[PDB]
Design a protein around this ligand. Structure first.
Ligand code: HEM
Ligand code: HEM
Ligand SMILES: Cc1cc(N)nc(CCc2cc(F)cc(CCCN(C)C)c2)c1
Ligand SMILES: Cc1cc(N)nc(CCc2cc(F)cc(CCCN(C)C)c2)c1
Ligand SMILES: C[C@H](O)[C@H](O)[C@H]1CNc2nc(N)[nH]c(=O)c2N1
Ligand SMILES: C[C@H](O)[C@H](O)[C@H]1CNc2nc(N)[nH]c(=O)c2N1
Ligand SMILES: [Zn+2]
Lengths: 407, 411
């Protein structure tokens, strides 16, 4: 019931007590581990509220206070009357920060307490949503000196008045299927791109077309908006040794901003809660550029390097992979856009774990997602045992809106 | 019940039914995933159902389920159990069992080869000297002058837990580690404790960076005895790089034969506590883990210096760059010397095909993603994108405690 995790590089052992507070389920059982699977009423509401308010009031050293009891009573009375309840600003900010703190798949959580929370609960329309999002984008970008932020739209009511950002991320490149049979731009975004066109977007059929926002307010029909180009900071990718690299025509955007997840706080559900931090280099250079079902540039790069691509054992793929990731980091750094390499980031995370174990009694972590997609065992997280469990508040996946939407 | 796994690169979906035959536990619960945790004398009572489960599987596999031969065998085993408190496997059952333990090993990427395993029956062995002879023969057969052949040698099963056969070496061939008074380490830091035991047991250490350890062999629960594997049987490979000529001067080599000797083979409830097995190396085992772990030979710095990489900031990815060159060198050396080796691209691609074949023919393939994905370049291998289900089937290979912690010394 008290669990130990070992680091096999350092022999440091940590003891986890925090998992006992866990409430949501894992997908795993005593007979089967699903650790590598990517996607495994009033009566319901009050214990969730209580659960949350207890941890909130504990966090401010006011557990068992009159203010605690009063709030507990006030929320209880409000649920009986209104079926739901509204969070105080203080609770909202606490909840969002802790959702991030509890994100077991996030290597960047050392930063969790430094998060700018934009309260957009007064938003009523898609145009309003657009305004709020432009402001988020500009604030977070900060001329390349990135700052973590979340913008939080009104909470779910009856599920028929959901606010949704249809984009999976605030900033992404379009995807187009060619009559050539091939794929132009980002293959991951082909279907979403069609929904944009079908809803009226005039696509420029390029390779790096920043997508438009598709915004849904109050359960109404979604609408299209274009982020001001001057608010989308992009970085042309060059290599600090290969002059030819620039001719590949690669660029990426500076702001990673996830917009499709569900924020759950104290039983309440925030269906539209876009959040952003800054990139770890491998996200772009390993996954975005080298994934086979993505931009898949390994072959082109290798040829420019004149590698023997006859036999896998020459490790030409591995060599190109490194150089591509070198270029990414170099290009962001040169243009003063915040970025972190996988060594720095995993090193920070180990320090964060040790802090969390020391100050909270644990840190839920998903090894499968925490270990970088390149050079795994030369990062300290590879050698770190991690316990994965679900704490609340949380960010959760939710179904894409086009499957759910009564049009 | 049915379970789906998805490959996120291809959208290929597979359906697992095999997990219904799972017995042993995972360590996980509905509240916690222990998927990245490294680690987790039997009564007649529990033994016969374990025997029966096994014998049912065996007779199904040879398409004689329910046959008179099947029924007589169950009969014969049941009686032998209630009479002698244990039982003996037939040669055929032993071979079937060993192959399936490998086939079931969810942490092994090399399982496409599982049906080609040479099984050496060493159940007639009685002394440590006899163990030595068997192990030399295994090493010679498996090495095959560089054309490596998978093999396993199976020593007598556990009886009361007081007469265990054990190979004290974690692997048959491995380099010594020596801790210096200044705190530095000569050789393989992983093997310091065991090296110290060997020395205490009377081994004369040459004290170099690549000293092959002697074998420490325990028969019938007696105190272990030291033996030196004939050097001419230990195939080694000097590591050089195809373009960097200074790489040879790093003075690196490795042995060709990876042979795990510290695990326990369970077949039909019987426990084989000494069952050394061998295959051939995937390059990253040596080039990534052995050479480049901070806790092992740790050569990243020296290599990076000789390549003259910018090492002042990690963002140059000097470590990643050096790591690739080292791994090219390992593969290059082995291939040049005609010693069997496989790269992590070939091996993972072969595993995916094996896994899919297993799903179609067997209804599943238990696999541990955390171990299957190679320790470099993870997502440019197809296993990274493959959802996997991890569960435990028997027969199986299991960890067991280190013998120096449990052994009762006779003196
Ligand atoms: C500030 C620097 C940050 C870094 C370096 C970072 C890094 C990462 C990385 C590399 C991943 C894996 C994503 C993937 O492979 O697709 C991830 C996942 C995740 N991050 Fe962080 N992140 C940062 C900020 C944030 C913030 C501000 C939040 C929320 C407020 C957050 C919440 C999450 C969540 C919920 C996941 C898992 C999402 C999923 O399961 O798909 N991150 N992060
Ligand atoms: C023939 C070529 C083979 C290849 C390329 C191969 C590859 C591998 C690799 C890379 C690992 C991970 C090792 C580590 O990271 O320490 C592994 C683990 C394992 N292999 Fe295979 N292997 C082969 C043959 C065999 C054979 C012949 C057996 C048994 C009959 C076997 C059983 C296992 C088991 C039980 C593990 C898990 C070890 C543990 O948990 O410590 N393998 N294999
Ligand atoms: C907040 C944040 C910071 C950071 N460094 N990275 C992220 C993820 C950004 C991202 C950006 C993006 F465009 C796509 C994805 C993942 C796509 C869906 N997966 C599940 C296949 C993620 C988010
Ligand atoms: C049979 C076989 C084939 C193959 N390609 N590889 C192996 C593993 C070889 C090996 C050889 C070795 F010396 C050490 C290890 C791992 C030690 C335990 N870890 C947790 C530190 C493994 C075994
Ligand atoms: C199947 C497997 O779970 C899938 O490929 C995962 C593996 N680990 C990952 N880790 C991160 N950080 N991001 C990912 O998209 C994935 N994909
Ligand atoms: C903590 C973690 O489970 C540990 O470092 C594992 C990770 N995956 C591995 N995978 C392989 N093949 N071999 C290993 O030793 C490990 N070590
Ligand atoms: Zn699990």
């Amino acid at each position: 019931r008290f669990l130990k995790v070992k680091n096999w590089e350092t022999d440091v052992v940590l003891t986890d007590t925090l998992h006992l507070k866990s409430t949501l389920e894992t997908g795993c059982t005593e007979h089967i581990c699903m650790g590598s699977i990517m996607l495994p009423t009033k009566d319901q509401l009050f214990p969730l509220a209580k659960e949350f308010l207890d941890q909130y009031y504990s966090s401010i050293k006011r557990f068992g206070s009159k203010a605690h009891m009063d709030r507990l009573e006030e929320v209880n009375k409000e649920i009986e009357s209104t079926s739901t309840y509204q969070l105080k600003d203080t609770e909202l900010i606490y909840g969002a920060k802790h959702a991030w703190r509890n994100a077991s798949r996030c290597v960047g959580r050392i930063q969790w307490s430094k998060l700018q929370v934009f309260d957009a609960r007064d938003c009523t329309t898609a145009h309003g949503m657009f305004n709020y999002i432009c402001n988020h984008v500009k604030y977070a970008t900060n001329k390349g000196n990135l700052r973590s932020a979340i913008t939080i739209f009104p909470q779910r009511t009856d599920g028929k008045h959901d606010f949704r950002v249809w984009n999976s991320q605030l900033i992404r490149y379009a995807g187009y299927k060619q009559p050539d049979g091939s794929t132009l731009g980002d293959p991951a975004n082909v279907q979403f791109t069609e929904i944009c066109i079908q809803q009226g977007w005039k696509a420029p059929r390029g390779r790096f077309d920043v997508l438009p926002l598709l915004l849904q307010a109050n359960g109404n029909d979604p609408e299209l908006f274009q982020i001001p180009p001057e608010l989308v900071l992009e970085v042309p990718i060059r290599h600090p040794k290969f002059d030819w690299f620039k001719d590949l025509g690669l660029k990426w955007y500076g702001l990673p901003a996830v917009s499709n997840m569900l924020l759950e706080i104290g039983g309440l559900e925030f269906s539209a809660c876009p959040f952003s931090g800054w990139y770890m280099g491998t996200e772009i250079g390993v996954r975005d550029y080298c994934d086979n079902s993505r931009y898949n540039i390994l072959e082109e790069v290798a040829k420019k390097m004149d590698l023997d691509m006859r036999k896998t054992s020459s490790l030409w793929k591995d060599q190109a992979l490194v150089e591509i990731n070198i270029a990414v980091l170099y290009s962001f750094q040169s243009d003063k856009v915040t970025i972190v390499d996988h060594h720095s980031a995993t090193e920070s995370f180990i320090k964060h774990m040790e802090n969390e174990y020391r100050c909270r009694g644990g840190c839920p972590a998903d090894w499968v997602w925490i270990v970088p997609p390149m050079s795994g065992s030369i990062t300290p997280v590879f050698h770190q045992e991690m316990l994965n469990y679900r704490l609340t508040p949380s960010f959760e996946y939710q179904p894409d809106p086009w499957n759910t939407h009564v049009w």
